[PDB]
Design an enzyme around this catalytic site. Structure first.
Site, PDB file in Angstrom:
ATOM      1  N   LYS A   7      69.362  41.338  62.668  1.00 32.11           N
ATOM      2  CA  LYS A   7      69.075  41.735  61.322  1.00 32.11           C
ATOM      3  C   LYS A   7      70.237  41.489  60.407  1.00 32.11           C
ATOM      4  O   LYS A   7      70.041  41.016  59.290  1.00 32.11           O
ATOM      5  CB  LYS A   7      68.769  43.235  61.338  1.00 32.11           C
ATOM      6  CG  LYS A   7      68.597  43.870  59.931  1.00 32.11           C
ATOM      7  CD  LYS A   7      68.037  45.265  59.983  1.00 32.11           C
ATOM      8  CE  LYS A   7      67.709  45.684  58.538  1.00 32.11           C
ATOM      9  NZ  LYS A   7      67.186  47.038  58.464  1.00 32.11           N
ATOM     10  N   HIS A  12      72.553  38.615  56.121  1.00 28.94           N
ATOM     11  CA  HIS A  12      73.893  38.341  55.661  1.00 28.94           C
ATOM     12  C   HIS A  12      74.568  37.011  56.009  1.00 28.94           C
ATOM     13  O   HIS A  12      75.634  36.751  55.473  1.00 28.94           O
ATOM     14  CB  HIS A  12      74.801  39.508  56.106  1.00 28.94           C
ATOM     15  CG  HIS A  12      74.406  40.809  55.512  1.00 28.94           C
ATOM     16  ND1 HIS A  12      74.377  40.992  54.149  1.00 28.94           N
ATOM     17  CD2 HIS A  12      73.940  41.954  56.053  1.00 28.94           C
ATOM     18  CE1 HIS A  12      73.989  42.216  53.877  1.00 28.94           C
ATOM     19  NE2 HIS A  12      73.688  42.820  55.002  1.00 28.94           N
ATOM     20  N   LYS A  41      65.482  44.588  47.261  1.00 28.56           N
ATOM     21  CA  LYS A  41      66.805  45.045  47.690  1.00 28.56           C
ATOM     22  C   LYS A  41      67.738  44.727  46.527  1.00 28.56           C
ATOM     23  O   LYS A  41      67.777  43.595  46.099  1.00 28.56           O
ATOM     24  CB  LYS A  41      67.286  44.328  48.969  1.00 28.56           C
ATOM     25  CG  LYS A  41      68.665  44.831  49.489  1.00 28.56           C
ATOM     26  CD  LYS A  41      69.131  44.320  50.866  1.00 28.56           C
ATOM     27  CE  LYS A  41      70.518  44.993  51.267  1.00 28.56           C
ATOM     28  NZ  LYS A  41      71.090  44.467  52.543  1.00 28.56           N
ATOM     29  N   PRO A  42      68.417  45.723  45.967  1.00 27.06           N
ATOM     30  CA  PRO A  42      69.158  45.495  44.727  1.00 27.06           C
ATOM     31  C   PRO A  42      70.526  44.749  44.779  1.00 27.06           C
ATOM     32  O   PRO A  42      70.894  44.197  43.740  1.00 27.06           O
ATOM     33  CB  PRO A  42      69.377  46.906  44.185  1.00 27.06           C
ATOM     34  CG  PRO A  42      69.474  47.705  45.382  1.00 27.06           C
ATOM     35  CD  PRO A  42      68.470  47.131  46.359  1.00 27.06           C
ATOM     36  N   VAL A  43      71.232  44.774  45.911  1.00 22.92           N
ATOM     37  CA  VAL A  43      72.482  44.076  46.155  1.00 22.92           C
ATOM     38  C   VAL A  43      72.521  43.602  47.587  1.00 22.92           C
ATOM     39  O   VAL A  43      72.230  44.366  48.578  1.00 22.92           O
ATOM     40  CB  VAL A  43      73.677  45.022  45.907  1.00 22.92           C
ATOM     41  CG1 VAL A  43      75.070  44.375  46.260  1.00 22.92           C
ATOM     42  CG2 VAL A  43      73.613  45.517  44.438  1.00 22.92           C
ATOM     43  N   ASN A  44      72.899  42.343  47.784  1.00 18.29           N
ATOM     44  CA  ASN A  44      73.001  41.809  49.113  1.00 18.29           C
ATOM     45  C   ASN A  44      73.920  40.627  49.128  1.00 18.29           C
ATOM     46  O   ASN A  44      73.896  39.854  48.177  1.00 18.29           O
ATOM     47  CB  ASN A  44      71.631  41.325  49.620  1.00 18.29           C
ATOM     48  CG  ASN A  44      71.667  40.931  51.030  1.00 18.29           C
ATOM     49  OD1 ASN A  44      71.737  41.793  51.897  1.00 18.29           O
ATOM     50  ND2 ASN A  44      71.640  39.616  51.305  1.00 18.29           N
ATOM     51  N   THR A  45      74.766  40.544  50.145  1.00 18.16           N
ATOM     52  CA  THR A  45      75.763  39.495  50.237  1.00 18.16           C
ATOM     53  C   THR A  45      75.475  38.549  51.402  1.00 18.16           C
ATOM     54  O   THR A  45      75.197  39.008  52.508  1.00 18.16           O
ATOM     55  CB  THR A  45      77.211  40.015  50.373  1.00 18.16           C
ATOM     56  OG1 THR A  45      77.570  40.732  49.221  1.00 18.16           O
ATOM     57  CG2 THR A  45      78.124  38.851  50.527  1.00 18.16           C
ATOM     58  N   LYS A  66      82.845  52.539  53.768  1.00 16.17           N
ATOM     59  CA  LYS A  66      82.566  53.351  52.575  1.00 16.17           C
ATOM     60  C   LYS A  66      81.912  54.643  52.870  1.00 16.17           C
ATOM     61  O   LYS A  66      82.118  55.641  52.171  1.00 16.17           O
ATOM     62  CB  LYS A  66      81.701  52.477  51.623  1.00 16.17           C
ATOM     63  CG  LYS A  66      82.470  51.456  50.934  1.00 16.17           C
ATOM     64  CD  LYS A  66      81.508  50.470  50.299  1.00 16.17           C
ATOM     65  CE  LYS A  66      82.127  49.542  49.314  1.00 16.17           C
ATOM     66  NZ  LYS A  66      81.062  48.436  49.060  1.00 16.17           N
ATOM     67  N   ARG A  85      72.743  40.056  43.070  1.00 11.72           N
ATOM     68  CA  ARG A  85      72.494  41.320  42.355  1.00 11.72           C
ATOM     69  C   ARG A  85      71.290  41.288  41.473  1.00 11.72           C
ATOM     70  O   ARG A  85      71.102  40.383  40.584  1.00 11.72           O
ATOM     71  CB  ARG A  85      73.731  41.811  41.638  1.00 11.72           C
ATOM     72  CG  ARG A  85      73.598  43.280  41.116  1.00 11.72           C
ATOM     73  CD  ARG A  85      74.118  43.347  39.708  1.00 11.72           C
ATOM     74  NE  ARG A  85      73.279  42.458  38.913  1.00 11.72           N
ATOM     75  CZ  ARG A  85      73.285  42.343  37.597  1.00 11.72           C
ATOM     76  NH1 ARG A  85      74.112  43.052  36.844  1.00 11.72           N
ATOM     77  NH2 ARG A  85      72.453  41.486  37.046  1.00 11.72           N
ATOM     78  N   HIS A 119      76.498  45.820  59.910  1.00 15.20           N
ATOM     79  CA  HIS A 119      76.366  46.000  58.451  1.00 15.20           C
ATOM     80  C   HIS A 119      77.401  45.235  57.656  1.00 15.20           C
ATOM     81  O   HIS A 119      78.531  44.978  58.160  1.00 15.20           O
ATOM     82  CB  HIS A 119      76.456  47.492  58.078  1.00 15.20           C
ATOM     83  CG  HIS A 119      75.548  48.366  58.877  1.00 15.20           C
ATOM     84  ND1 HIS A 119      74.175  48.368  58.664  1.00 15.20           N
ATOM     85  CD2 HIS A 119      75.804  49.346  59.780  1.00 15.20           C
ATOM     86  CE1 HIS A 119      73.617  49.220  59.523  1.00 15.20           C
ATOM     87  NE2 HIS A 119      74.585  49.849  60.187  1.00 15.20           N
ATOM     88  N   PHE A 120      77.057  44.904  56.401  1.00 13.46           N
ATOM     89  CA  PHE A 120      77.972  44.266  55.481  1.00 13.46           C
ATOM     90  C   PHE A 120      78.441  45.386  54.566  1.00 13.46           C
ATOM     91  O   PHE A 120      77.646  45.991  53.824  1.00 13.46           O
ATOM     92  CB  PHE A 120      77.329  43.152  54.658  1.00 13.46           C
ATOM     93  CG  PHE A 120      78.332  42.380  53.924  1.00 13.46           C
ATOM     94  CD1 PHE A 120      78.928  41.328  54.490  1.00 13.46           C
ATOM     95  CD2 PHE A 120      78.686  42.761  52.663  1.00 13.46           C
ATOM     96  CE1 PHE A 120      79.955  40.665  53.788  1.00 13.46           C
ATOM     97  CE2 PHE A 120      79.702  42.120  51.985  1.00 13.46           C
ATOM     98  CZ  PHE A 120      80.272  41.027  52.573  1.00 13.46           C
ATOM     99  N   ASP A 121      79.716  45.772  54.638  1.00 12.39           N
ATOM    100  CA  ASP A 121      80.132  46.973  53.861  1.00 12.39           C
ATOM    101  C   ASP A 121      80.576  46.648  52.463  1.00 12.39           C
ATOM    102  O   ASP A 121      80.312  47.440  51.479  1.00 12.39           O
ATOM    103  CB  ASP A 121      81.157  47.777  54.662  1.00 12.39           C
ATOM    104  CG  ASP A 121      81.258  49.212  54.265  1.00 12.39           C
ATOM    105  OD1 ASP A 121      80.152  49.812  54.206  1.00 12.39           O
ATOM    106  OD2 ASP A 121      82.432  49.755  54.012  1.00 12.39           O
TER     107      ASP A 121
END
Length: 124
Positions: A7, A12, A41-45, A66, A85, A119-121
């Protein structure tokens, strides 16, 4: 189903360009990768490096996450990434995103055996 490592890869990793060229990329990638199916999804890198390069970050600089957990790692080297974004005009299901290319250090949370990114922090 789908493992946490898978995932992360789906949400990512984008090893295929060096740098998200132009303005279309997030609109297309957030959709292709299923990040807009329930909601936008509002923000993703996305990270444009090799899988081994990102997995290696789990043995790099340990830093606080975080959320306060201790299982985050910052890359020693900068990496090519693309921040997606969500725009203010974006209405689900036609999700719209500003695409921002940058070279920054990434911060990922890692878990498991094998110890891999889940996860991408953040980017710094």
């Amino acid at each position: 189903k789908e493992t946490a490592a898978a995932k992360f890869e789906r949400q990512h990793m984008d090893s295929s360009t060096s740098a998200a060229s132009s303005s279309n990329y997030c609109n297309q990638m957030m959709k292709s990768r299923n990040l807009t199916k329930d909601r936008c999804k509002p923000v993703n890198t996305f990270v444009h490096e090799s899988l081994a390069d990102v997995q290696a970050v789990c043995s790099q600089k340990n830093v606080a996450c975080k959320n306060g957990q201790t299982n985050c790692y910052q890359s020693y080297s900068t990496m090519s990434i693309t921040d997606c974004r969500e725009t203010g005009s974006s209405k689900y299901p036609n999700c719209a995103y500003k695409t921002t290319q940058a070279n920054k250090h990434i911060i990922v949370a890692c878990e498991g055996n094998p110890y891999v990114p889940v996860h991408f922090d953040a980017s710094v």
